[PDB]
Subunit: 328 residues, 4 copies
């Protein structure tokens, strides 16, 4: 270990890894808007996640509009989130560009602004094979050794699922402490990737299947990721505590409740179609849940079949009732 | 300003020349600007009609902004007004593209060769809104629409082309030709002569003979291997020498057949930056270094295909430059 | 066989299999309207169709019983009475059953076989060549039309396969894709070097025929059973090099058929081509048929409406070009 | 029928169709080794297999003649002699041929049908339900195992189709995908609410049995013909809730089979699974069989080696646990 390296390890990734959206002002869908981040809501939201018991906070994944925020907006938003968290929990800043050098340059500045790590996708103009994927993450880790890294394994967004041999290599990179994974959406690969990282990387399933992997692999699968904490974090923190207590019957009933709340999200049950518009559908979910306030999404992802927003709003309202139940 | 009428003949697309350490993530500026100038001047003197920079194989993805603006400025200055210059500008969102497009126009580019954000795919409505936004924000810039289904996660719809043909700034589209045969003809009908739809150099003769009033231009990503084969193809089409066009077309397809690993189109697209770079090196018409991070990994045998294609084309360049 | 590539010229018409009103019931032992089949085949001869083909995809090659296929083919062959070549569509799950069906259809008087390939697993080019060579060697008295249908048979037939298929004497034509796969059409065309007739679409024929007049002397049409007059006229226009007329007619054909594809979605039409085409044949009123056979009976009603509207539009074209010989 | 979901417990073994040495010749009219068919089926009973099924994908349902399929199923049925339920695999291109095959198969003594669906056009969820309802109604004396193979039949059965299928008493079980489609396995599982046995793979049965001990009380295995002892032993460990042992043995089964997928590519294996599995059955030595039937005889030779290695690795596990 070097005094410059990140102090965070796989052991610090435990419990709920919450991913928040980037709150937006009412003119956020206009190309002429110079600055579209609602910074008051951002700070209140970040603080709400700490007080609600989120264990790790991440920003600006896909639905966080990593793609469409300006660099000025990304910096200001992350700095506001970091100041609001005040070091109480680790903060991973979502930084994904079209190439290795811009990602490195953004990652250094985000560390300067006090983020503890980076939630990093990968360039997607062309797909990267496994050798290309490992070289990218190693490049980022060597250039910014002071940042921990959460690997963004999103096959649709980045044009490919990260291979098991790539995970084995990623787990030798000390900065890599976690990966946002697919859970049962890629069930066989999740277990293959799990063996490949040998407890050196925390592989994060979904809130809707964390219990299944946690029971089967209690020593390894000790955290999940959730993009629904901004609808209210209480259903997921409670799942964390049910798992910790090994109340498997209670875990199953809560898990059924979460999937039930989210079922309307996918238009006509079509998951590939939800991914086509995940930014727009999630935004209507966050609005409807009423736990945070936000405006429209940013250019260019403003156009969506109106009926798809119906599924988002129902899912938000469904989750609101869960939040209210478990907020006690 | 530029209109559809200004896009005729060979629309050449050049790569971005690179210095020997271009493949290192710690290299801050990787463009060989002397080569960029020499290459652009060579395209003008070799008969290229319209010059475009920084599409996919131009490494629009992996250049830094400082690299892109300094490369565009050098190309525009070396061209010195002789032919139109379209700066390739493509980012992950509308607002960075507009901001890049404004500065690129301020640096003297005549237009923008624009692809669209692809983190999420855009539907026909989101695609039309993106190009309208750009055109309204940079009204002085003509626009070449970048229809690349694999890069941008979907083929631009015929209804989308219908709307794009109502935006005056949209003067041309880099299209797929026979790789999307039905769409090309459907799109060509939707734009109704208001947009120049550019097929491939290997497809151009077929579409020009069938639609001589509308398909009066193609694009070529091979001009940096030597533009003489394609400018010759242009003159043969203008003269309506269909036998000679067919024979030259077979020569062009013959030269490039090794570009595709096992003939597989889709494998080539996954590595088109790496494979094209090897072709430019071997053709020897220009010099360049390796590719930029992150696109430095590629099955070695795919590079052999690009090199042999580049050597094959260099032979065509020598044959047709002596006319 | 006596047939060669030279015998494949003009309009290769593919017809559906006419059905009785109870054809959609699984308890219907025999569902072919044999009277209408004979009327249909005769009208194809009388209307100028140059080659007749039966039981492709929309002809329900999959869902007819073996007894239905034998009887339908016998009726068609007898009504054609040697006036034009007849290719019986025979496609099963394996080489041996296809060979068995091929020999029997030859005994009932068909001149050749319109053959797709086994589809349970995809065949690679070696497997594709072996299959057709097997069929050709076991039934050498039957000419062959290769059914190149990527969706049905799980892949596009490769250009090296076409090179090998062009050394088999029985192989005289291929039902191809035209501009739906334009680069491959021209690759396959070079490969066969005039030994196989590569049949594009009726909407594509003019383009390929103008560019390659010595080779692309024929197309296939699955619309003849709505009335063959527009397609045979297109043949006559191409033979007269009336290119402006060819372009105008091609537009009229594509125009009549635009409502075939729901919301313009070609892929969605292909999931229900049997059901939609059946609606088209009914509405066009050139032939009479009942419903489709099990298992292909379920379809959104909206998709049927688009097929019927296509049928009515083609009927107007049939009325126009059928009377162009005698009118004003 | 008297068979219900309650009778589908333990190892559901799927066996291939033994072939004679000239089985790969299209002029061979009858290619089944019936003596080997009888010996294997008996060996499956004596080895602890709880349910036997024939003529799925690797059993070459596609490429056997009807006369072959009858004779093979009859021979298996006679050899089993009522000891365990036998599901005859019948999948044709249409409803009526499947039904008529299915009636004959019940007349030859099969207890039910292992049925995949017509695949020339893909069937949507309503067409899937109608197909299986039609078969169930035409031959109500026959229990049915639904064959959920998305590659073979052009689509994963939708969860709404499973909800409806679970109202058809004849439908007792489905050959499923386990962690290959884990999210859907669970959705389908909730939808059937214990009225249909959803069969995961032998390599993830332990995971699903531990989580759902009262529902997922059976798996399917396509490796029983390499020796059924490793899989019946897994059944016993699962019943005994010996989870540590279950995990280690699950790892052993995965380890023995890894050589099967060319360079770890599952989709590549599926393109040649009949050919590759054939190599594995020969190598394991538990049964003898000739080559595959037309048209699935072409396959890269290295893929076969990967199947041969898997056979030998499995034969070591068989010897270990047949102890
Ligand atoms: Cl002409
Ligand atoms: Cl337990």
């Amino acid at each position: 270990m070097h005094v410059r390296d990140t102090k965070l390890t796989v052991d610090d990734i435990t419990g709920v890894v919450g991913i928040i959206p980037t709150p937006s002002i009412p003119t956020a869908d206009q190309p002429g808007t110079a600055f579209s981040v609602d910074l008051d809501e951002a700070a209140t939201l970040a603080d709400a996640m700490v007080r609600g018991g989120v264990d790790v906070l991440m920003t600006t994944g896909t639905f966080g509009e990593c793609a469409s925020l300006t660099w000025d907006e990304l910096q200001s938003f992350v700095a506001t989130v970091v100041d609001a968290v005040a070091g109480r929990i680790p903060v991973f800043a979502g930084a994904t560009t079209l190439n290795t050098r811009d990602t490195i340059a953004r990652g250094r500045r985000l560390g300067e602004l006090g983020a503890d790590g980076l939630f990093v996708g990968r360039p997607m103009w062309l797909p990267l094979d496994d050798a290309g994927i490992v070289r990218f993450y190693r490049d980022v880790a060597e250039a910014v050794p002071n940042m921990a890294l959460v690997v963004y394994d999103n096959p649709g967004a980045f044009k490919g699922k990260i291979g098991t041999p790539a995970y084995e290599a990623l787990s030798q990179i000390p900065q890599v402490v976690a990966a946002k994974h697919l859970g049962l959406l890629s069930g066989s690969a999740f277990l293959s990737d799990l063996r490949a990282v040998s407890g050196r990387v925390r592989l994060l399933p979904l809130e809707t299947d964390w219990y299944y992997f946690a029971r089967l692999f209690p020593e390894e699968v000790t955290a999940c990721w959730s993009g629904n904490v901004a609808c209210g974090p209480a259903p997921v923190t409670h799942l964390r505590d049910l798992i910790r207590a090994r109340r498997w019957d209670d875990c199953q009933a809560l898990t059924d409740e979460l999937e039930g709340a989210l079922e309307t999200l996918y238009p006509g049950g079509n998951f590939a179609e939800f991914l086509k518009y995940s930014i727009q559908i999630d935004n209507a979910q966050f609005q409807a849940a009423g736990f945070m306030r936000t405006g429209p999404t940013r250019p260019p992802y403003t156009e969506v079949p109106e009926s798809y927003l119906a599924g988002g709003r129902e899912a938000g309202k469904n989750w609101a009732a869960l939040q209210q139940r478990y907020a006690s």
